[PDB]
Tab-separated table of C-alpha atoms and ligand atoms in Angstrom:
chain	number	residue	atom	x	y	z
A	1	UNK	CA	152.963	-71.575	27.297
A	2	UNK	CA	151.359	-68.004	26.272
A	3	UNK	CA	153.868	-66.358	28.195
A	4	UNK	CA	156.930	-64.918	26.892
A	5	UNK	CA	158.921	-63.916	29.860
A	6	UNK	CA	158.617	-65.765	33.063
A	7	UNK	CA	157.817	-64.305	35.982
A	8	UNK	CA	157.850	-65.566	39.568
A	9	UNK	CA	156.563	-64.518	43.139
A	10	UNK	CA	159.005	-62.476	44.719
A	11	UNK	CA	157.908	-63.781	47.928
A	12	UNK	CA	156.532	-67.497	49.583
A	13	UNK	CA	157.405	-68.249	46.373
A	14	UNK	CA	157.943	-71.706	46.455
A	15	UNK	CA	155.184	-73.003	49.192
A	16	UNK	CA	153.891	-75.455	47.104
A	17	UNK	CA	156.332	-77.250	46.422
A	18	UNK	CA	157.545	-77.354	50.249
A	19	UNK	CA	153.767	-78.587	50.495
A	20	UNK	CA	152.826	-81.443	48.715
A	21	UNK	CA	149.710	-82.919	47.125
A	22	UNK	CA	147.589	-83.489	50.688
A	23	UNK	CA	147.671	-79.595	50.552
A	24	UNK	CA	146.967	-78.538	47.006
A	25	UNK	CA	145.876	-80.950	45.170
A	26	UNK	CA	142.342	-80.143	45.525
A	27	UNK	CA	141.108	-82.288	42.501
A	28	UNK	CA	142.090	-85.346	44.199
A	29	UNK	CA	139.607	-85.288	46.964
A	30	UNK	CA	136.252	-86.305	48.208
A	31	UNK	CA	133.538	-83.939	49.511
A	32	UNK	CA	131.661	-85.487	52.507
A	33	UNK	CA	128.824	-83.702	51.889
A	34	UNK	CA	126.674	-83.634	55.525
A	35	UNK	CA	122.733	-83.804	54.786
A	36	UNK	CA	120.997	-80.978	56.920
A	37	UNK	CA	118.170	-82.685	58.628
A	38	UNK	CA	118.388	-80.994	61.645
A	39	UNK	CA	121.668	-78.661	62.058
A	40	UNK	CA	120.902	-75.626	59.994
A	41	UNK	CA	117.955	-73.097	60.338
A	42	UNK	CA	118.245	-70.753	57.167
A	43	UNK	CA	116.868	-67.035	58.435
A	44	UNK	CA	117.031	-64.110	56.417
A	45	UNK	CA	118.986	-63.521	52.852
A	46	UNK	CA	121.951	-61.459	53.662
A	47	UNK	CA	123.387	-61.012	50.144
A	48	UNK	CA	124.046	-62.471	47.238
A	49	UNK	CA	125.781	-67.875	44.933
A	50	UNK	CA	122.598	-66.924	47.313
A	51	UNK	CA	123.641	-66.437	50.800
A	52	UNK	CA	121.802	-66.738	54.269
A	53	UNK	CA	121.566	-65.844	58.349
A	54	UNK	CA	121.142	-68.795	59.616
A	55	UNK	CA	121.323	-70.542	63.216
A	56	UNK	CA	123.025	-73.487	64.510
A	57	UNK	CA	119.865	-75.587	66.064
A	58	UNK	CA	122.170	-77.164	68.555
A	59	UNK	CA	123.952	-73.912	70.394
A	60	UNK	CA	122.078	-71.109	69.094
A	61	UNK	CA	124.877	-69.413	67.211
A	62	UNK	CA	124.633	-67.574	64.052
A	63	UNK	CA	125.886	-68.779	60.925
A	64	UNK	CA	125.962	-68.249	57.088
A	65	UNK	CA	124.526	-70.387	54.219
A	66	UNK	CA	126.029	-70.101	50.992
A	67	UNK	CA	123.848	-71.954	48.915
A	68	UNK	CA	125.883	-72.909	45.498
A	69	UNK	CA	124.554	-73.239	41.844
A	70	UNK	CA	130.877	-75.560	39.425
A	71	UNK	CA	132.186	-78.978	41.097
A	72	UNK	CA	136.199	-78.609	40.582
A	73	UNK	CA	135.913	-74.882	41.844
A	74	UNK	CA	133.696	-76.153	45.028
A	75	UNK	CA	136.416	-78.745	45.805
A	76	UNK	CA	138.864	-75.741	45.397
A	77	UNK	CA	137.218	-73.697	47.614
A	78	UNK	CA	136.812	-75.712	50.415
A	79	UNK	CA	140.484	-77.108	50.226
A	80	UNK	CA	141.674	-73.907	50.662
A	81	UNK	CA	139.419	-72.910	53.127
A	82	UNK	CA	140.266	-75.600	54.758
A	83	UNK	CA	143.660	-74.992	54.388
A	84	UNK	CA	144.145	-71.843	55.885
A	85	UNK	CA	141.302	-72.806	59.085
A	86	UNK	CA	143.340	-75.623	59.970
A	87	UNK	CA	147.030	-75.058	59.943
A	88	UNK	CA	148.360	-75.603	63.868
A	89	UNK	CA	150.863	-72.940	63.657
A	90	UNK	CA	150.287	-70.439	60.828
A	91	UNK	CA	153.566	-69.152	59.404
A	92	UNK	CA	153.313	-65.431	60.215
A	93	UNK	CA	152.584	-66.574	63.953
A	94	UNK	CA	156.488	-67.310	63.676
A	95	UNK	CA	159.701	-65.390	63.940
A	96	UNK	CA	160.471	-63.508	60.676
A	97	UNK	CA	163.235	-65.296	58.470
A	98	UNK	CA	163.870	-62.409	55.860
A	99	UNK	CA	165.788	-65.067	53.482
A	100	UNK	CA	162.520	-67.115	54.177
A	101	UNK	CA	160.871	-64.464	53.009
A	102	UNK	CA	162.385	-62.864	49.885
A	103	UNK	CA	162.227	-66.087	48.164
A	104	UNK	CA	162.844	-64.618	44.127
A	105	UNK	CA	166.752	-64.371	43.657
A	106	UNK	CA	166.260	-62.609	40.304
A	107	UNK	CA	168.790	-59.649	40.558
A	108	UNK	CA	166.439	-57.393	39.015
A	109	UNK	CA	163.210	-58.524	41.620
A	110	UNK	CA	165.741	-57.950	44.624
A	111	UNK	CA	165.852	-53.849	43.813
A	112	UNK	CA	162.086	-54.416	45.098
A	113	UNK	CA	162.691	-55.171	48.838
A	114	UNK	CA	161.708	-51.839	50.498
A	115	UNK	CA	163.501	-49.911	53.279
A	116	UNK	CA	160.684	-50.774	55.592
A	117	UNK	CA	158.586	-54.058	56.205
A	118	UNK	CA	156.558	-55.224	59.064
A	119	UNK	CA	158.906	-58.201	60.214
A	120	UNK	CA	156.839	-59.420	63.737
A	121	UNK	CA	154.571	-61.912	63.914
A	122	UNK	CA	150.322	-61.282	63.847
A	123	UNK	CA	147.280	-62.743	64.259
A	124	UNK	CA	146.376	-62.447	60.529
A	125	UNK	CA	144.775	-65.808	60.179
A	126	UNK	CA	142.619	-65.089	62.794
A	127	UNK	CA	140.950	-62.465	59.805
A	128	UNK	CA	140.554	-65.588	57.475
A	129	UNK	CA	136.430	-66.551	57.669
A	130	UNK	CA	135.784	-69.717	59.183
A	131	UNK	CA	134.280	-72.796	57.441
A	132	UNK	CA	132.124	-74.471	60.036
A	133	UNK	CA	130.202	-77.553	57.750
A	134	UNK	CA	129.579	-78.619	54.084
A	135	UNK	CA	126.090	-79.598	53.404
A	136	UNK	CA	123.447	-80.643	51.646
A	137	UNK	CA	119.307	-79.322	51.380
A	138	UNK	CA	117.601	-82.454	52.914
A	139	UNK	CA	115.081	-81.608	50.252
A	140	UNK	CA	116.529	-79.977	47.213
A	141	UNK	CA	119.909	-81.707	47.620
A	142	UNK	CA	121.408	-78.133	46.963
A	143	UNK	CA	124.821	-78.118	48.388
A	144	UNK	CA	125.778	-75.182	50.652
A	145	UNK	CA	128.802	-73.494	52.847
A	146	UNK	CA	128.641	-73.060	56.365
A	147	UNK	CA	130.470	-70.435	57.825
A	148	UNK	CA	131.078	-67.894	60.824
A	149	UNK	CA	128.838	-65.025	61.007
A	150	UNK	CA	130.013	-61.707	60.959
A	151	UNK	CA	128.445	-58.391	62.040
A	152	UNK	CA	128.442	-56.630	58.699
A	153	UNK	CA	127.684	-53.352	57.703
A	154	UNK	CA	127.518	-53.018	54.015
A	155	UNK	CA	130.841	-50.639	52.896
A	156	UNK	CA	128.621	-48.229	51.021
A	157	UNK	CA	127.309	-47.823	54.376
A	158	UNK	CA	129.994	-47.984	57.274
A	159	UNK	CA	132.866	-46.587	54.872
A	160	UNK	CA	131.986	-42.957	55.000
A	161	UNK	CA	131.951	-43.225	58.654
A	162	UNK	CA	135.346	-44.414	59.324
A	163	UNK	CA	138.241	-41.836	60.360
A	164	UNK	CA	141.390	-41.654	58.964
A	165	UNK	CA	142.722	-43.927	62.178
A	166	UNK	CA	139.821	-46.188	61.509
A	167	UNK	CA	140.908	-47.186	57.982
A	168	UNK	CA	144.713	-47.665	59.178
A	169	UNK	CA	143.151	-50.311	61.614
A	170	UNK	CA	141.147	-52.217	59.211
A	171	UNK	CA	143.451	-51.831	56.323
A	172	UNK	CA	145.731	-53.103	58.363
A	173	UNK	CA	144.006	-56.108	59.401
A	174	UNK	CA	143.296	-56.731	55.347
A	175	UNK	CA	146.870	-56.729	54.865
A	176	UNK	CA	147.606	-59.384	58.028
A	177	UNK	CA	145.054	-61.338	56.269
A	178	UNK	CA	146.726	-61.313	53.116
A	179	UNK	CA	150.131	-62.045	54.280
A	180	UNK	CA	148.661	-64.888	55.956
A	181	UNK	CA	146.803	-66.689	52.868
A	182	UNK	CA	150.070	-65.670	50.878
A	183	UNK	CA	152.703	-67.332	53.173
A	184	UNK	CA	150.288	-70.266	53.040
A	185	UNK	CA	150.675	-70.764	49.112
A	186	UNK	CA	147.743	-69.059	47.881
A	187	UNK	CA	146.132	-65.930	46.179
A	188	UNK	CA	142.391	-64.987	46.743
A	189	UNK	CA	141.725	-63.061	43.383
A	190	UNK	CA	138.995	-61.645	44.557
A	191	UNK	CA	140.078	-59.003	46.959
A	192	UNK	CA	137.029	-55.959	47.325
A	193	UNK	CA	134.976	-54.328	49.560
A	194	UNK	CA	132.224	-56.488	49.299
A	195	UNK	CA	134.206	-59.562	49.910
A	196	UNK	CA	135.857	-57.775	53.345
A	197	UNK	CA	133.169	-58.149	56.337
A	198	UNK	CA	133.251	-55.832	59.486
A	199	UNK	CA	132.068	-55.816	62.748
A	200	UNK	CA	133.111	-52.517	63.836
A	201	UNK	CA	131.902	-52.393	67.151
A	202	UNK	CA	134.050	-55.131	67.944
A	203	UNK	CA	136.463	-53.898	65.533
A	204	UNK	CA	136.538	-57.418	63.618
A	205	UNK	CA	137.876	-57.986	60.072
A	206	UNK	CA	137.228	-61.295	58.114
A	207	UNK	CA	138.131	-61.807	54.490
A	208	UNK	CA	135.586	-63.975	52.740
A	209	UNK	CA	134.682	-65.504	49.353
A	210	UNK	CA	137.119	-67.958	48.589
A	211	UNK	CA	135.429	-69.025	45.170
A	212	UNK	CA	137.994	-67.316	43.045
A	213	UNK	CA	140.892	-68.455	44.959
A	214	UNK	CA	143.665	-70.550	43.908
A	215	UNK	CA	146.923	-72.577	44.778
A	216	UNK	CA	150.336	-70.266	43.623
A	217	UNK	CA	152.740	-72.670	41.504
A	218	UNK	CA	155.894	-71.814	39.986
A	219	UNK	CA	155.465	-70.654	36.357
A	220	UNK	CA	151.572	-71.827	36.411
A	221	UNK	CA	149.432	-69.876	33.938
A	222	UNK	CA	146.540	-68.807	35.474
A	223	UNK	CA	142.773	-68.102	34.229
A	224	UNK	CA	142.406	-64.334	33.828
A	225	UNK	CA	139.078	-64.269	34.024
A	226	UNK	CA	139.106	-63.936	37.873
A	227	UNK	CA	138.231	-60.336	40.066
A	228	UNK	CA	135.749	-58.514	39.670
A	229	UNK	CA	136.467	-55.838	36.475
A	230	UNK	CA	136.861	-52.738	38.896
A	231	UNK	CA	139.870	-54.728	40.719
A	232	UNK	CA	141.048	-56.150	38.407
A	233	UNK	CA	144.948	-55.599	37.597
A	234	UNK	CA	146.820	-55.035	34.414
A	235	UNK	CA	148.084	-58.267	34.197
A	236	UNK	CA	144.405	-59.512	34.008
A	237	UNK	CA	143.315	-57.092	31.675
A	238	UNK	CA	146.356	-57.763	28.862
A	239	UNK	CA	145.893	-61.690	29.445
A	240	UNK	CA	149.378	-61.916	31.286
A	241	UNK	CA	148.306	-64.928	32.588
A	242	UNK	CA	152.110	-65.971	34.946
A	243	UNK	CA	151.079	-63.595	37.903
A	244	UNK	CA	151.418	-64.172	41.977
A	245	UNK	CA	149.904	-62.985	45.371
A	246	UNK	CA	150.674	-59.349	43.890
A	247	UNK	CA	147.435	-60.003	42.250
A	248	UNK	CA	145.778	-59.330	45.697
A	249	UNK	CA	147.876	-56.103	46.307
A	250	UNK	CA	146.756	-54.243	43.053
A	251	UNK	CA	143.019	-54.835	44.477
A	252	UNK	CA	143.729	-53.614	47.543
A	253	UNK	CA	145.883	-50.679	46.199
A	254	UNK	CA	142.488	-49.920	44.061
A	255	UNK	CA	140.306	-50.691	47.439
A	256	UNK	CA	142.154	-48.253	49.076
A	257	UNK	CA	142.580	-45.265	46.869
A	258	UNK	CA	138.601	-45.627	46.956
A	259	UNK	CA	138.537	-45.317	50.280
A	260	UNK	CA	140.977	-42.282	50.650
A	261	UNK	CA	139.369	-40.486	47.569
A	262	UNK	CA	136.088	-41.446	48.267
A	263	UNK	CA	135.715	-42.247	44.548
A	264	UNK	CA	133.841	-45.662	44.744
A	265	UNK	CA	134.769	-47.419	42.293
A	266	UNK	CA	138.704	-45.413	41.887
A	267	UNK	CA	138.987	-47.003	37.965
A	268	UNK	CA	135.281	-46.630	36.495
A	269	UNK	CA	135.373	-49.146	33.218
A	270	UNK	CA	132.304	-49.488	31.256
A	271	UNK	CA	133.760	-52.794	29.823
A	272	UNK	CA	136.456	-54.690	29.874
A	273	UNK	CA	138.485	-53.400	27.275
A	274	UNK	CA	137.585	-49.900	28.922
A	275	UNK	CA	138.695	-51.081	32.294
A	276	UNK	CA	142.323	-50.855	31.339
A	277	UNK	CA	141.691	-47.758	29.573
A	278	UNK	CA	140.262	-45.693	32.552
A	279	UNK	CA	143.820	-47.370	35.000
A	280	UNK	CA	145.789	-46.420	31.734
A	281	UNK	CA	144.509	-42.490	31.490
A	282	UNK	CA	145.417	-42.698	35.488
A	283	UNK	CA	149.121	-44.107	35.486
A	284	UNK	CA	149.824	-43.435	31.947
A	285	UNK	CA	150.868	-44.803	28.570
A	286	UNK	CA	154.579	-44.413	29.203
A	287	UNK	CA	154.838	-46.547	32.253
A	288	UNK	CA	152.411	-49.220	30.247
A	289	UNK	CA	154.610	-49.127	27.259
A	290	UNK	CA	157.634	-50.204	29.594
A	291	UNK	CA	155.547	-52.674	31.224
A	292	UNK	CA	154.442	-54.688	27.904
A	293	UNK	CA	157.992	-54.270	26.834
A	294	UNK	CA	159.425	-55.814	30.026
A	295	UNK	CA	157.133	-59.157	29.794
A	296	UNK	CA	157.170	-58.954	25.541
A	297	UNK	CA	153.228	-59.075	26.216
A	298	UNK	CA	150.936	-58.361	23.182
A	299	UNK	CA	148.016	-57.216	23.791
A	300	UNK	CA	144.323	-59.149	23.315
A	301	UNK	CA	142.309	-59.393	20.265
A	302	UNK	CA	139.939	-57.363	21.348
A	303	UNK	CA	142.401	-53.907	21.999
A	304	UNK	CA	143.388	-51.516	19.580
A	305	UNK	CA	147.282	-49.937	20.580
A	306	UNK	CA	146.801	-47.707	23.789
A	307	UNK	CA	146.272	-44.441	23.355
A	308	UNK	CA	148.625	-41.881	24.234
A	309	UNK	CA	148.225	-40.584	28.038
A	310	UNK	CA	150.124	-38.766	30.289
A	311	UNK	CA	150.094	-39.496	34.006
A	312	UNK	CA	147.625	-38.046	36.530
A	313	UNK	CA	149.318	-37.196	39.368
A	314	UNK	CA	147.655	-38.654	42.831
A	315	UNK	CA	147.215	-35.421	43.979
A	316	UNK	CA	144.550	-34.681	41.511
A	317	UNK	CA	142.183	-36.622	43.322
A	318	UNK	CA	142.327	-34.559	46.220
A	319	UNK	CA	139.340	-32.627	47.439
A	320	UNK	CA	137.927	-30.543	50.296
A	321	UNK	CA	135.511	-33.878	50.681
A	322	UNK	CA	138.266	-36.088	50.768
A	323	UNK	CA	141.222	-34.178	52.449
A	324	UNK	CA	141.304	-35.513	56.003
A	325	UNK	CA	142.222	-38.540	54.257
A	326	UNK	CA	144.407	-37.860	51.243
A	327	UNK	CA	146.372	-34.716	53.190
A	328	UNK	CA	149.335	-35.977	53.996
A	329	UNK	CA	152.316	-37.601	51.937
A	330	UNK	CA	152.309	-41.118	53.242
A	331	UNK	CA	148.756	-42.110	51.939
A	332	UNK	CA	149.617	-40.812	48.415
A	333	UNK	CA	153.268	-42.818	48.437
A	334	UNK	CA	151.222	-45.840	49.701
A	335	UNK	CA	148.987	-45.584	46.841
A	336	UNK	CA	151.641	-45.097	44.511
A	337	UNK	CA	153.615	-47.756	45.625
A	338	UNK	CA	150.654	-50.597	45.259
A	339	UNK	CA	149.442	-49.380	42.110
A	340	UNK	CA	151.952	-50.361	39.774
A	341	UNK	CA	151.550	-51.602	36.154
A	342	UNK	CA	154.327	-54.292	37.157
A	343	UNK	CA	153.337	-56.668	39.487
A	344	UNK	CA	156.870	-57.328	40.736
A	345	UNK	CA	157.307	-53.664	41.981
A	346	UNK	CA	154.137	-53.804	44.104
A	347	UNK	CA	154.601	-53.612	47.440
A	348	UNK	CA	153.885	-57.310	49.209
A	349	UNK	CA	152.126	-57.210	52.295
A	350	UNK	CA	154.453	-57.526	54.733
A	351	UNK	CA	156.041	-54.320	53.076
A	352	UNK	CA	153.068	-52.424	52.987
A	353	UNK	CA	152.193	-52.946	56.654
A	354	UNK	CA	155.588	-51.564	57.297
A	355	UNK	CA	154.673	-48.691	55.118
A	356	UNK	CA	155.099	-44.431	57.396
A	357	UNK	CA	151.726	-44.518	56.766
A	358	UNK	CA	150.547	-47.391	59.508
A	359	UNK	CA	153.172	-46.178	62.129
A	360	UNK	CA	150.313	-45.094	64.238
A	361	UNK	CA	148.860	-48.563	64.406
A	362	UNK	CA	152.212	-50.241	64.748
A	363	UNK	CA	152.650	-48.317	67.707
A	364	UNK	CA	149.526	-49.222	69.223
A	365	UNK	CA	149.691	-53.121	68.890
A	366	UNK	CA	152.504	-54.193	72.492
A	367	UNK	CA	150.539	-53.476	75.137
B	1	LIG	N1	126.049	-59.857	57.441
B	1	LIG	C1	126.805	-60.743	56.758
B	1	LIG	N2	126.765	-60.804	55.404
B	1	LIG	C2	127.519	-61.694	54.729
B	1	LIG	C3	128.396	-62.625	55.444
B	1	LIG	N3	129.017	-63.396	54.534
B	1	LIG	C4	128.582	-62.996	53.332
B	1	LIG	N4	127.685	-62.003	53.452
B	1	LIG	C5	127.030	-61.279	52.343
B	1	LIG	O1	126.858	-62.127	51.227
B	1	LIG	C6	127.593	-61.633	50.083
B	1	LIG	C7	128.036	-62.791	49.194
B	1	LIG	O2	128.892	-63.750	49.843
B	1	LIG	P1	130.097	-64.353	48.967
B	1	LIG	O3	130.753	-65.469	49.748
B	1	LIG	O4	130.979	-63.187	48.505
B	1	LIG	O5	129.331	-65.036	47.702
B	1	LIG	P2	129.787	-65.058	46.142
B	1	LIG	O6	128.621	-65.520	45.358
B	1	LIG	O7	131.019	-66.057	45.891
B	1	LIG	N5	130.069	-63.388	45.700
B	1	LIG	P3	131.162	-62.897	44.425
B	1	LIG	O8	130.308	-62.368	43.166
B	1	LIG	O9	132.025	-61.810	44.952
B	1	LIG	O10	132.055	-64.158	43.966
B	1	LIG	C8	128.701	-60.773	50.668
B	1	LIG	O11	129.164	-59.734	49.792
B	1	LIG	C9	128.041	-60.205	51.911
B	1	LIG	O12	127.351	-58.986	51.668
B	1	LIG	C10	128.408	-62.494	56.908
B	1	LIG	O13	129.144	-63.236	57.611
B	1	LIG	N6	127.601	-61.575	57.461
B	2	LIG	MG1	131.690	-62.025	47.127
């Protein structure tokens, strides 16, 4: 154990261990790996694992190839995705069970509940993408990923487009997504624009690549090496290696101040090291002090001591570009609150959906 103080999920903390091995015990299985002879028409690249349009030969439909170059990680992937498309009656489809919920009895997690959560049930798995068929190149032998097709349009595109209401919505619908895969045992790692798809004609969400993701067990230390480096959080960056679904709500804290301060990527490292530097000069060597303190971490070979520096207030980002989406107070407290050195203060995501700042789409959703 590198870990000097434990840490726990504060929430769906113990999910797998109310699940047993037929859930997460992903080493344990067999792929049936389905030769494509005559199912799978591969179309035009799409992005890039190399991934394809393709069509279903039978009915027509669209699909996507994700032709692999990694065996345990494969099996881990489609486990969860399987998972999470299969569950009869996903948990945040039920009624809200607060002690259910707030699952960490640590004194000291508990000052973390918020005033405010989103305590109805959604749709959120609905924004998980679909695996459709596991296959083989008749050919090659190349194993591939079939999944649902989505509508894309590439962020760097469609994000400068969206108002502020339109980014409520589909932030929104990232966070229902979240709290689904959470409440189902498992963090994606990987959270990022690129890995978000939208259809926004039809105002469809679906959270893809499921490569990094990974089962959440009590006291488990995890591989740090995950993200990608401009999402990555702290606890990646100083090899605290006993972290949770909170993971997911430091990229999506990071994903979001993007989008508000249309600053693409918000924390600009030029390496790894520099990474935590550039979050560092933004929250500020005092609050990182407390945090390395409060877990007794020591820092990686590769760091000298942090530099000293003081915060940069949110409202430094703001510009005449930006300010019809970082004007008002509830944006800049929803920032704040998700981009925290300390994963345990972080909002989760049933707390940030309750968050002033998505009242107008609350209201929206009984019709
Ligand atoms: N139009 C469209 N593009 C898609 C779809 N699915 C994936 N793509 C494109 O293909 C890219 C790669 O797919 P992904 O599953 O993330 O593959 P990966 O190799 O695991 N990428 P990463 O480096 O993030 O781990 C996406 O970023 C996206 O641009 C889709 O349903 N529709
Ligand atoms: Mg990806």
């Amino acid at each position: 154990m590198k870990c000097r103080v434990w840490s726990e999920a504060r929430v769906y903390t113990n999910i797998n261990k109310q699940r047993t091995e037929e859930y997460w015990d992903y080493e344990n299985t067999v792929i049936d790996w389905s030769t494509n002879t005559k199912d799978y028409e591969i179309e035009n690249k799409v992005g890039r694992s190399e991934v394809f349009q393709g069509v279903k030969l039978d009915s027509k439909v669209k699909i996507v190839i994700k032709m692999l170059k990694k065996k345990k990680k494969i099996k881990r992937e489609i486990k969860i995705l399987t998972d999470l498309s299969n569950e009869k009656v996903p948990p945040t489809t039920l009624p809200f069970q607060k002690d259910q919920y707030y699952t960490n009895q640590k004194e000291d997690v508990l000052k973390f509940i918020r005033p405010y959560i989103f305590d109805q049930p959604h749709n959120g798995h609905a924004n998980i993408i679909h695996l459709f068929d596991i296959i083989k190149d008749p050919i090659s032998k190349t194993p591939a990923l079939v999944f649902e097709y989505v509508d894309n349009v590439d962020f760097r595109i469609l994000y400068p487009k969206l108002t502020d209401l339109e980014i409520r919505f589909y932030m929104f619908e990232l966070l229902k997504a979240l709290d689904y895969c959470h409440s189902m045992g498992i963090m994606h790692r990987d959270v990022k624009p690129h890995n978000v798809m939208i259809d926004h004609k039809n105002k469809k969400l679906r959270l893809i690549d499921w490569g990094l993701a990974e089962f959440y067990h009590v006291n488990m230390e995890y591989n740090v090496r995950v993200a990608s480096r401009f999402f990555k959080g702290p606890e990646l960056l100083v090899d605290y290696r006993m972290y949770d679904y909170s993971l997911d709500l430091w990229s999506f804290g990071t994903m979001l101040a993007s989008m508000i301060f249309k600053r693409e990527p918000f924390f600009h490292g030029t390496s790894n090291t520099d990474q935590l530097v550039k979050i560092v000069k933004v929250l500020g060597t005092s609050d990182f002090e407390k945090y390395l303190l409060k877990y007794e971490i020591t820092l990686p070979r590769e760091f000298y001591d942090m530099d000293q520096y003081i915060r940069k207030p949110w409202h430094r980002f703001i510009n005449d570009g930006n300010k019809h989406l970082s004007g008002n107070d509830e944006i800049i407290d929803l920032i704040d609150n998700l981009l925290r050195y300390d994963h345990q203060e972080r909002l989760t995501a049933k707390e940030a959906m309750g968050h002033p700042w998505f009242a107008p789409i609350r209201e929206q959703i009984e019709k």
